[PDB]
Design a binder for this molecule. Structure first.
Ligand SMILES: Nc1ncnc2c1ncn2[C@@H]1O[C@H](COP(=O)(O)OP(=O)(O)O)[C@@H](O)[C@H]1O
Ligand SMILES: Nc1ncnc2c1ncn2[C@@H]1O[C@H](COP(=O)(O)OP(=O)(O)O)[C@@H](O)[C@H]1O
Ligand SMILES: Nc1ncnc2c1ncn2[C@@H]1O[C@H](COP(=O)(O)OP(=O)(O)O)[C@@H](O)[C@H]1O
Ligand SMILES: Nc1ncnc2c1ncn2[C@@H]1O[C@H](COP(=O)(O)OP(=O)(O)O)[C@@H](O)[C@H]1O
Ligand SMILES: [Mg+2]
Ligand SMILES: [Mg+2]
Ligand SMILES: [Mg+2]
Ligand SMILES: [Mg+2]
Lengths: 97, 443, 426, 426, 436, 70
């Protein structure tokens, strides 16, 4: 059952290549303060200082396997294949070679 | 993993090089005009140039239209997506009907990206791993051999961690991927020196690899457009690829994805392989769905849609008027209709023989004639179902062949639609009517 | 090589400078009056002055309403936003129809802005924490070296990105995103066998600054200001996985976004590009959608929405006793300008078939093309249009390039029309 | 609030004198003498604030300025007073109950002004010493137009200024109570007096906003996202009693406003049942209702009603009836509309437009003005001549002509039974 | 002040023997209805019976809501009174039955009293002590802490548990800060810094607070009124917890959920226990359902079942229609739109229409409470108008007449003002005629 | 549950069956009062009975000539 049953975490972990290859789009517009304002962890929030710091520490210590999706959807960094593709002449050279 | 299903006997359309349907081949029988039309549509799909055509399969029940679709799918083969859905699946609760239809359409467009990978493949000579106690530094080196060469490699931290996780042992034959870093144990070279456990679990020896130790191989990634949409829709969309609950993805994402895929195709990075979407019992669909279908076919990244319907003229759902095939004339004008005719007796007899061959049921000649006569009288599906019951009855009789008496017993025990209707009409008092009256007592 | 669709041949309106339309330009045949009206509408849109203007393309089936819409979209260009729709799309299940309609309204209004991107890119040389504490990281580039102080969020990103000393990293200052681009080339020989990917040391100076132009819509800003959308912090992950479904954006948020856009325009950093919203199958819209669309047309910030309808004296969906000219209640009808689109005669049908054959790379004999045109005249133009691909497939099966009459007759005998199927059912 | 040109942009007021007698043409409003008089009486009643829970209906033919009247009332009422105009199709939501939505709509139009006096120092900046523990020793100096003096900081002020990393020679605002620090650009600008000023800031909020603020842990996000949810009734009762206590204390004042439902003919009988009671209670605003249909069946009911509203509501409302415009009123309204749209029409063109609007609709001619202007622009002409208006009439159709065209060729359109004659032949 | 429709109603206007004066408490007429309302108010004040139901039946604009609000005013602010309308029951988060149950319980008030002891003042000393022997405890081995508090009446030196010291450390309290310790729970609150040290630093962000009045250790008995639904909500959605999971749940919207019968059973048990000890007392209130005609058949059936509970307020119903089909049913014509089985459980209080004199007196009172002066002739014209079309029309038309009179700078409304108001605003019958 | 997950489960089950460790048991799905199903459910049964992997469905009905629901 350890192979017949594969949870969502191991499925995210094992399919790294597809996630790397196909995550292309990035958000059109973002506002950075909404990340902390949504959870109430801002400096002038109604949440207490000690509780806020405790939540921040727990978030720092917790582990997330979906980080790769976040970093791929944050910046559309092109890979080493583009130097083959950015220049059509290099493409023709590749095929001819 | 499969069982003998209603269409498990058909392996394609069975056509010649000139699209002339053979009288019977690849399991399909007769229906020559419809099979020729299906072959023309098949060639159009395999060409990959014509986009967004709609084709409608019409005609009486049991006239093989779903078998025709299954043959079309078998002719398409692998590497060409084929999404068979029913009209009942569209009406969902978590997605708008147009959203569900969009997800269905995007499941029908396939993208193939080919990549070249460098692969190390070897027999392990020895492996060494020097890790410091109460320290994070670890040192290791690997020796890996091929039939014509042997080489040593000194191992990095991540390579050491991966090899330690895989528990590589010198009597393993293993491949090392320099990019991914995954280690797959292909087999064993010799025994485990006869330690006192795991004595003889490695008997299945494998031959040493041959050739260059580091060789380049190509890997093809086949992914549907809908999967790409779900991946790029949100951060949690990858989980939604298996869990579902993708939500109503925003249209701007779809527009950006379309533009990006168009650029990828024009760049040669990716190859687009459009497929065929098949809808069953389309008349179940709402007029809102057909309205969306009218525009959806016009899109350039749309597959070729084939629709099965048989209800004839009937009241279109959502309206109070009957329509020629249960579909509005808006969709009917833009669709090409392929028709299916009733079967002759001989076509039925050969279908029955083919089904008995597929089910591994040996029917006698007289039994085959009786089953064919029953099928001609009432229905092809009824005789098809009777075949297996007759086989089971024969097995109960301890005989290796199915005789006429087994078919007679199957007919006697199990009823057809007409016989049940007649018995109901004679005994209407024993069943609950539409007015909610029935006699339970016998006195 | 290339794929073909219903409107692959439609390249534009083909109108001259004076506005009059030639008989055959831009792939269009006939319908000159409608083309002239559409050109006037294009000028109205390009003026970028009025808001909420609506027109109705009224005509029978297979008459050129979607063709006109796509031609308008092409002629305006990719800069402007043109959004086609069916009314069926509005009937969402997550949010009310009003929210979807308003979202589509503001999605059809474009904004073009100028933004400066601050970029740092380096190989890493030191990693010191200021003690969740700030981190001190050293970076070098081909022109030199620099040491940076990063906020705790960036520290969490770097820790969760498995950055080592001697790794090459990309930091976008605006978003605070850290990406590990790979391992430096200087350590290529550090081992013989590892999963490292080696990248060369970045060229130039460590800090770079460039000015880009990016196109956004009002809906994109609304979504940005409503929910978190990116980030490499676990806080961002929790913030965005919470409340996943769409919500009914309030009028206050839209007002604030409008005020922000006005401020940006006043400062000159942004420019407005009003666009078009196209709704097809408008008869699908219920009376409620038309009732609210009455309100949106009076809104001071709305695109030039165009409506296509092809039903006459049909009852309005939802209502039971409202007989309307096109399923559109009289309240909305007064807000519209009706552009009539007329059917096609035999000669124009023949010319259209000829051009479609030329576009799809088919060769048709004159007699075969005449037969196809006359059978389209007999039954329907679209029937002739969809028969072209099967005819081309049939010709190839005969090892023959040009289409002959036999292929057309065979295609007619194989595939039937709706009228023929209805006759067969009877 | 930068926006394009709409169909109501010209309405800058209701055009009343001191004696509430409306002038023939002022603030954009023509004619409608009795309607404007009644609107002004309602406006004065709202400004007085001593009358609560009054519903006013606007009545008479569609396209007779009922929305224009309501807009005139909103603009003449000015800012600093709520005026909520919501369509009846926005009430029906899948996340908020219709009663809950109506309650929120009523409360959104009742404003409460609360004064907060904050101690903030506004100054131009001079050098800052921060030192380590000898918890922390630091001094800052601020310059203004007539002082330059040193403040000695404490722990939290030092922490805040380190977090802000304030530079020198620029401009900084620090609040003594809140502790917020607001940065400002370099001295164009300069401090204008004392270093520490005592100025009160007034905050305008509604009862709904207070309800949402106290609703959750971080409920103030719901004021923009719109995912408030059905608030508990005890929460609203608490808000009501605390607002009453504050008003008694004199620390907050209430500004009653106007609620406008533009399309009352879409609410069902349940909505009317709730509305009947919502008007009676205190803190109920004044509701403006507009309807165009004479006698119809109320949604949710199987019987007709004198205005689309149940008689119980009609007993509770006062009805303002609008006469249809005459030819002179049409002419002058078209003149105002053309002037607003920056179109120079000729006298004969103006007369033709007047007669066209009188014959078909004022809205139709209003939309034809921009089409005519664009048509003239293609001819490189400044003044709009008669031939431009005639071409605009010919190219773009009104409702009646389109109806005639459909009626004479009903065979080529889809009928109510779903039949159509696609075939051009036979 | 704002003038609502029922502002002039100040009370039921009854005598000590139950007789109602002709004009008292803002009421005009309705003698029998007022007497019945007085009997019902006496029944409510008795606080003995559960599940009794009465129905205020009459035509539109007769005084059903007026009687309901008069009952609410007469009962006083110590008796629960939940107003409602029939349409609000149709929720989208939970079944209408659950919303009826929730609102139905809201009208059962409970008055619970609790004595609390609090230590408050300004900290003067804080000297943590360790155990006398290092072997006495684990790790830090921190013993009691000594804190010195200052108040307006003197100072006191307290000896605190190490848990209270941990609370002090959590709240970040330094010398001079005004604090607040609850011996009931051991909770420490940081009020702020003393106003004595306000000018210690010339620029600092600190919430300076005055020195607490009274003694340092003040014991007070706290009395609060809490509904049963409040306890149900507290159990269903507790606000406790400081975990990340707790915070994530806190950020979530408070959607209504179908609170199970088991939770109500447990609440009833605990409330019975505390009432048995005498600490708390139960106060059955009144639930008001206006426009009972709009309820669905399911809501009516659940009302039938709710009245059989052991704890149940007196539901008062209003209906303005007769012989009307019940919503959600096709064929059942019922007396007041109320199913016959529910009518059998009700007591109908008939209210009768008014004559010209009652309308005249009502207009007088309404003009008086509106701070408007009306001429006798104009008042007779208004009364004739009201008896011609409707009373509510005149009662609302008083305000435009006053505004018009003010625009002419007249202290009182003149007949010409009433005529001009008539011209400006029409009525339902006149609108129907003009639309024909 | 998306079709991808179902196909993946089928594939892994097929792999482990081919390895010889697992055996497949079809089973029986009895749907009492089949009259209660709607017409959409009936049409999906029409499609689902053709599925390559499906159990044996036993249906019961106590009704006579009545209009099919939906
Ligand atoms: N021409 C044919 N050749 C082979 N098998 C057929 C043919 N027509 C029908 N069948 C088989 O008969 C059965 C009924 O056909 P089916 O496709 O279900 O009809 P329909 O699509 O009208 O429901 C299926 O098992 C199908 O595979
Ligand atoms: N005037 C025309 N010239 C060229 N092709 C046309 C013309 N009108 C229609 N077509 C072609 O036939 C199709 C039917 O037109 P369409 O716009 O869908 O009609 P409608 O929208 O009125 O139903 C178009 O997609 C286009 O490919
Ligand atoms: N008295 C008026 N003066 C100027 N413009 C008017 C007047 N009445 C109506 N309009 C204009 O004519 C159009 C129709 O008015 P509108 O309020 O939309 O009609 P209705 O509310 O009756 O549908 C709007 O553009 C409006 O600005
Ligand atoms: N007995 C009365 N004495 C004085 N004023 C009354 C009396 N009854 C009703 N009113 C006034 O007339 C109005 C009509 O009563 P109300 O309860 O609103 O009628 P409805 O039956 O429509 O709810 C009340 O709002 C109140 O202002
Ligand atoms: Mg079939
Ligand atoms: Mg079309
Ligand atoms: Mg209007
Ligand atoms: Mg009433």
């Amino acid at each position: 059952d350890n192979e017949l049953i594969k949870p969502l975490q191991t499925r995210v972990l094992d399919n790294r290549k597809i996630i790397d290859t196909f995550a292309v789009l990035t958000p059109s517009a973002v506002s950075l303060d909404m990340r902390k304002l949504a959870l109430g962890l801002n400096d002038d929030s109604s949440v207490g200082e000690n509780t806020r710091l405790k939540v921040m520490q727990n978030c720092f210590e917790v582990s997330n396997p979906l980080h790769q999706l976040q970093t791929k959807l944050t910046i559309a960094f092109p890979d080493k294949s583009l130097l083959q593709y950015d220049c059509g002449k290099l493409q023709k050279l590749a095929i001819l070679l | 993993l499969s069982l003998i299903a209603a269409h498990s006997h058909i392996t394609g359309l069975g056509l010649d090089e000139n699209l002339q349907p053979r009288p019977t081949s690849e399991g399909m029988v007769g229906q020559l005009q419809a099979r020729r039309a299906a072959g023309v549509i098949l060639k159009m799909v395999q060409n990959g140039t014509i986009a967004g055509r709609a084709v409608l399969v019409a005609g009486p029940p049991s006239t093989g239209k779903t078998a025709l679709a299954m043959g079309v799918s078998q002719s398409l083969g692998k590497d060409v997506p084929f999404t068979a859905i029913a009209g009942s699946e569209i009406f969902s609760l978590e997605l708008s009907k147009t959203e569900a239809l969009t997800q269905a359409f995007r499941k029908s467009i396939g993208i193939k990206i080919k990549e070249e990978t460098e692969l190390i493949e070897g027999e392990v000579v020895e492996i060494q791993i020097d890790r410091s106690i109460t320290g994070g530094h670890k040192q290791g080196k690997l020796t890996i051999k091929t039939t014509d060469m042997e080489t040593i490699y000194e191992l990095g931290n991540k390579m050491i961690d991966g090899l330690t996780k895989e528990k590589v042992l010198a009597g393993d034959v293993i491949s090392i991927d320099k990019a991914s870093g995954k280690i797959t144990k292909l087999g064993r070279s010799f025994a485990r020196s006869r330690d006192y456990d795991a004595m003889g679990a490695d008997t299945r020896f494998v031959q040493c690899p041959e050739g260059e130790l580091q060789k380049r191989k190509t890997v093809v990634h086949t992914v549907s457009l809908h999967e790409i949409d779900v991946i790029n829709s949100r951060t949690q969309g990858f989980l939604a690829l298996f869990t579902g609950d993708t939500g109503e993805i925003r249209s701007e994402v779809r527009d950006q994805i379309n533009t990006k895929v168009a650029e990828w195709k024009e760049e040669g990075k990716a190859e687009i392989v459009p497929g065929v979407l098949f809808i069953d019992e389309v008349h179940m669909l709402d007029i809102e769905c057909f309205s969306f279908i009218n525009r959806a076919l016009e899109d350039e990244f749309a597959p070729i849609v084939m629709m099965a319907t048989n209800r004839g003229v009937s009241k279109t759902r959502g309206t109070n008027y009957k329509s020629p095939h249960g579909l509005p004339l808006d969709l009917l004008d833009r669709s090409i209709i392929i028709t299916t005719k009733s079967y002759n007796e001989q076509e039925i007899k050969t279908i029955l023989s083919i089904r008995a061959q597929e089910e591994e049921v040996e029917l006698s000649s007289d039994a085959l004639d009786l089953l064919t006569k029953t099928g001609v009288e009432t229905s092809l599906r009824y005789s098809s179902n009777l075949i297996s019951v007759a086989q089971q009855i024969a097995m109960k009789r301890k005989n290796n062949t199915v005789e006429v008496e087994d078919v007679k017993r199957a007919y006697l025990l199990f009823l057809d639609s007409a016989r049940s209707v007649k018995y109901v009409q004679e005994n209407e008092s024993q069943y609950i009517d539409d007015q909610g009256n029935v006699q339970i007592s016998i006195a | 090589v290339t794929r073909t669709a219903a409107h692959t041949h439609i390249k534009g309106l083909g109108l001259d400078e004076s506005g009059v339309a030639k008989r055959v330009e831009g792939g269009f045949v006939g319908q000159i009056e409608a083309r002239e009206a559409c050109g006037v509408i294009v000028d109205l849109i390009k003026a970028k002055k009025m808001s909420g203007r609506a027109i109705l393309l009224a005509g029978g089936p297979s008459t050129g309403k979607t063709a006109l819409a796509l031609a308008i979209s092409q002629e305006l260009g990719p800069k402007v936003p043109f959004c086609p729709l069916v009314g069926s799309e509005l009937y969402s299940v997550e949010v009310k129809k009003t929210e979807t309609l308003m979202e589509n309204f503001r999605r059809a209004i474009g904004l073009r802005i100028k933004e400066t991107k601050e970029v740092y890119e380096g190989e890493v040389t030191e990693l010191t924490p200021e003690d969740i504490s700030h981190v001190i990281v050293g970076l070098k580039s081909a022109k030199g070296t620099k040491t940076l102080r990063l906020d705790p969020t960036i520290y969490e990103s770097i820790q969760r990105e498995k950055v080592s000393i001697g790794d090459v990293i990309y930091i976008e200052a605006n978003t605070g995103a850290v990406k590990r681009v790979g391992r430096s080339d200087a350590y290529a020989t550090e081992f013989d066998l590892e999963t490292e990917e080696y990248v060369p040391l970045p060229k130039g100076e460590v800090h770079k600054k460039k000015e880009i132009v990016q196109d956004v819509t009002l809906h994109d800003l609304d979504v940005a200001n409503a929910r978190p959308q990116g980030g490499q912090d676990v806080i961002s992950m929790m913030g965005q996985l919470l409340k996943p479904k769409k919500t009914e954006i309030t009028e206050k948020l839209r007002q604030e976004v409008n005020k922000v856009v006005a401020k940006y325009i006043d400062q000159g950093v942004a420019e407005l590009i009003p666009g078009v919203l196209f709704i097809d199958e408008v008869n699908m819209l219920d009376i409620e959608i038309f009732t609210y669309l009455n309100k949106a047309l009076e809104s001071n910030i709305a695109p030039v929405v165009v409506l296509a309808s092809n039903r006459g004296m049909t009852t309005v969906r939802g209502t039971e006793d409202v007989i309307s000219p096109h399923g559109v209640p009289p309240d909305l009808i007064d807000r519209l300008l009706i552009v009539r689109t007329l059917p096609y005669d035999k000669d124009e049908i023949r010319t259209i078939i000829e051009r479609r054959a030329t576009v799809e790379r088919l060769q048709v004999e004159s007699s075969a093309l005449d037969l196809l045109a006359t059978m389209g005249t007999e039954t329907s133009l679209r029937y002739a249009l969809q028969l072209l691909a099967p005819c081309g497939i049939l010709a190839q099966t005969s090892n023959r390039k040009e289409i002959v009459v036999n292929d057309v007759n065979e295609a007619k005998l194989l595939f039937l029309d709706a009228k023929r199927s209805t006759k067969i059912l009877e």
